[PDB]
Design a protein around this motif. Structure first.
Motif, short mmCIF file in Angstrom:
data_model
loop_
_atom_site.label_atom_id
_atom_site.label_comp_id
_atom_site.label_asym_id
_atom_site.label_seq_id
_atom_site.Cartn_x
_atom_site.Cartn_y
_atom_site.Cartn_z
N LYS A 58 -5.54 -15.03 9.11
CA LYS A 58 -5.01 -15.72 7.94
C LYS A 58 -5.63 -15.22 6.65
O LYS A 58 -4.95 -15.15 5.63
N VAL A 59 -6.92 -14.86 6.69
CA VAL A 59 -7.56 -14.29 5.51
C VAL A 59 -6.84 -13.02 5.09
O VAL A 59 -6.54 -12.81 3.91
N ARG A 63 -4.72 -12.29 1.72
CA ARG A 63 -5.15 -11.20 0.86
C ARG A 63 -4.01 -10.24 0.56
O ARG A 63 -3.87 -9.76 -0.57
N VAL A 64 -3.20 -9.92 1.57
CA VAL A 64 -2.05 -9.05 1.37
C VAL A 64 -1.08 -9.68 0.38
O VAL A 64 -0.56 -9.01 -0.52
N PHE A 332 -15.95 -6.74 0.29
CA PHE A 332 -14.67 -6.92 0.97
C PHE A 332 -13.56 -7.21 -0.02
O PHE A 332 -12.46 -6.65 0.08
N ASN A 333 -13.81 -8.09 -0.99
CA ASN A 333 -12.74 -8.52 -1.88
C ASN A 333 -12.28 -7.40 -2.80
O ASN A 333 -11.10 -7.32 -3.12
N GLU A 334 -13.19 -6.52 -3.21
CA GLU A 334 -12.88 -5.52 -4.22
C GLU A 334 -12.38 -4.20 -3.65
O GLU A 334 -12.20 -3.25 -4.41
N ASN A 335 -12.15 -4.12 -2.35
CA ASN A 335 -11.66 -2.89 -1.74
C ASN A 335 -10.14 -2.97 -1.60
O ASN A 335 -9.62 -3.87 -0.95
N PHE A 338 -7.41 -0.87 2.01
CA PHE A 338 -7.14 -1.36 3.35
C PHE A 338 -5.66 -1.24 3.68
O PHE A 338 -4.80 -1.55 2.85
N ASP A 339 -5.37 -0.79 4.89
CA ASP A 339 -4.00 -0.71 5.40
C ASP A 339 -3.97 -1.40 6.75
O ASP A 339 -4.45 -0.86 7.74
N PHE A 340 -3.41 -2.61 6.78
CA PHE A 340 -3.35 -3.40 8.00
C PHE A 340 -2.05 -3.21 8.75
O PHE A 340 -1.82 -3.88 9.77
#
Lengths: 341, 341, 150, 50
Positions: A58-59, A63-64, A332-335, A338-340
């Motif tokens: 869920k996080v 975020r997405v 984590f927040n400032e990156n 990320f490709d999920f």
DNA sequence: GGAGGCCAAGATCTCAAT
DNA sequence: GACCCTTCGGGAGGTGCATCCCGGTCTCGCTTGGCCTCC
RNA sequence: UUAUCGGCGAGACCGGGAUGCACCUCCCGAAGGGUCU
């Protein structure tokens, strides 16, 4: 890349229960025991891992970001892979020679799969069991008895139509007769079921067949019941759960955690604190917990660990202490790489 | 040139499990037993030896040095020789039998290959099994069951788009259908399997062929599924492990250990303490241990050994006592005539 | 094992020469260790008598205990017979793994050429495994019909 | 995907729930603050009225 | 320049399996 | 400070789902000549 | 006891993913009373 050990305790604000398939038996509901039958129960680390993994899922989804309709960009396969580590597309290979070096990039692009792995990619997050500090910190809860609504309270009789009162009369009569029949069948069923202890090996198959046929006759007796299939009035068997205020020692760890992965994990803990509910029996509010973890790291070759900070989850809020943990969450927040998918 | 015997205990902080090929069966996952099917389990000395050998390999990798890119001077072959003990290029200095002082130079220059050895070079380090002290210090852990995240948490459906919702519905219907079909095939398969106990061997062969074809039918039916080959919802079979807090007695020895090789072994133990994990199922944090070893030496010709010191590995640090162990570590860390290539 | 222990006792007792080299040559070493005489210089007692080598037994206790060829030894060492009925089991086992498919942090040490070499190694291992499995399958098929063969 | 619609139509069965439909309402046990807050009560005895 | 020492070469094939 | 009198019963469920894979080693129990360096 | 003497040995982490969960009021009736500065 450093190892983070989460050492702490879990305090239950409400009873904590879980139904593990092997743990329970025909006798009733039980917690899984640390050793054998007469051993101290524990709360599984599998349930904690699942709850934290779905919190992390869920996080990532939040975020997405959702679209205007409120839908997520992820495909069904991607939701399944993130939250449960299931490749429904049938593309996962355990020992692909070309994947020998491709794990690093997949971890660097997908913090959730790196933390909680899949079949073929080891997960850096290990979440252990919760084991109570004291003795007699578990008990049998939840025992009750479903009642007939209209016998407990007669003021609801005047709401029913005349035709429906006869429906309830037929319900009660059919319940009485079916119950006496089924109880007779059961008491003869158990009478020969007790013979399993000392019986011929050859007759053992027939005794299994005999009991199975008795079960078929019970099901047939229930099938001919018209108004209801199962009796409304019945006692509810209790479940075993940790007591309110139990202190369970819990230990988590992340092996070679990047700052981004540790930040994702701490954000999963922060999101979990909104509904700190482990285990089952959501009704009766079972499972609510209150936990504090002390984060320590250990550089290989050193002799003593280093304490980074403490994560405290309470009903009044979440406390994160130590510059390192804040740095991890920020990282984590400032990156944005990320490709999920 | 002394013999060092490491007699001590391994205390378990999280369940300790291991999958040995000859120990596990179709019935379920079992720990390797100390002889027989009903005897007490043990933790294999092979797993401990492999973990400590890789820890020593990483000690050597760190000690040699890493370039600005974080690459070690060792090629693939050196890494395989130092950790796995296997040579791939075929350049290992094979010692024809009859050679006087066969490994002398290799042992003097390569303490890792002297301690743990390879094919043709006896290793000085012997790491034995871990035996529990009491009874019922093992049990079935793990368990649980994978579940549809969208049947459990309905709030996840809001993220899914309509096409993916329909895909989910088809996936679930397909799962139910395939489960029923495979179930019927399994019923016939186990019928033939219970017929496998027939005295006639020829029938047993015929039954084995038919069981094989039924397994092919199961695989075929699974391939026919289009949404997901594997069922998402499935109980997870438990694994057997030593309970938390189990006391396992351990013995390790180094035969004719110089100061440098003993120092390398002690440094391997020190580095092992950073991530003191044995065995598998680390996803549930299984394998954490804390151990303490009492180091003794026995000069041949004398009647009693002499204790050199004690190595204690705890989550709070590594404690090494006795000036002799410190002397060993200093001798290893201050010898610059080691060539590991 | 006990003969080697006695040989070590003798070596320790006799000590080392001034130069530090053991005073036993190959012939004496094999006489003490294996009991063979490699140069043919050993005394050959007459076969008739039993109480032979009295002088040799008096001078060399190890040869007296554990004999040599031509001189019976006084030490008899029997088997170690188990007491129980389930005191043996299939230990050892295990399975050799690949150090880079188990620990991913080790890949960071490898350079690009070494990573390529590892990938080639894994591919070759898989291909050879499949081919050898096919050959073994054919060989076993031959074995099954071997008994039925004329 | 039928829960959402069903829960919107039927708030009661959404709250408390049924077999197969999870209920949103969890109502835990009531734990006394202090000690010695429980005792034997009632009792008494039936007696011949006459 | 024996004299020590190493290394490669020489025929064809061995059934028993809780 | 003497003693009665200790209850009845109802009613016990239903479901799913049971995974995929690697990869199985190398010696040796003899003698002699050809040839490389050595003392 | 048809004689005599001879350690079979070396190297190898089997590991990777999975929330077991859902619904249920245990209720109903009963004066413990009487004699003595």
């Amino acid at each position: 890349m450093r190892t983070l050990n989460f050492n702490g305790k879990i305090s239950t604000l409400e009873p904590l229960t879980v139904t593990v398939k092997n743990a329970v038996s025909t006798s009733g509901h039980r917690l899984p025991r640390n050793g054998g039958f007469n051993a101290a129960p524990y709360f599984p680390g599998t349930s904690i891992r699942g709850t934290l993994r779905h919190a992390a899922h869920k996080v990532i989804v939040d975020r997405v970001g959702l679209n205007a309709d409120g839908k997520s960009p992820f495909d069904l396969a991607e939701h399944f892979m993130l939250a449960q580590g299931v490749d429904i597309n049938g593309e996962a290979e355990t020992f692909a020679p070309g994947e020998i070096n491709a794990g690093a990039e997949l971890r660097s692009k997908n913090p959730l799969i790196s933390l909680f792995g899949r079949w073929g990619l080891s997960g850096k997050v290990g979440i252990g069991n919760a084991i109570p500090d004291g003795d007699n910190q578990w008990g049998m809860f939840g025992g009750g008895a479903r009642s007939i609504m209209f016998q407990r309270d007669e003021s609801l009789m005047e709401f029913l139509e005349t035709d429906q009162v006869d429906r309830l009369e037929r319900l009660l009569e059919e319940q009485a007769e079916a119950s006496v029949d089924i109880s007779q069948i059961k008491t003869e069923q158990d009478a020969l079921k007790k013979a399993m202890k000392s019986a011929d090996k050859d007759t053992k198959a027939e005794l299994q067949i005999k009991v199975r046929e008795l079960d078929e006759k019970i099901q047939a007796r229930k099938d001919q019941k018209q108004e209801s299939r199962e009796s409304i009035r019945r006692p509810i068997d209790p479940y075993e759960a940790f007591i309110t205020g139990a202190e369970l020692s819990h230990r988590m760890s992340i092996k070679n955690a990047t700052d981004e992965e540790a930040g994702l994990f701490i954000s999963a803990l922060i999101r979990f604190a909104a509904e700190p509910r482990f285990g089952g029996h959501a009704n009766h509010n079972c499972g609510l917990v209150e936990a504090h973890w002390t984060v320590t790291t250990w550089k290989p070759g050193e002799l003593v660990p280093v304490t980074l900070g403490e994560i405290v989850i309470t009903p009044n809020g979440v406390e994160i202490t130590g510059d390192e943990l804040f740095a991890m969450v920020k990282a984590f927040n400032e990156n944005q790489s990320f490709d999920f998918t």
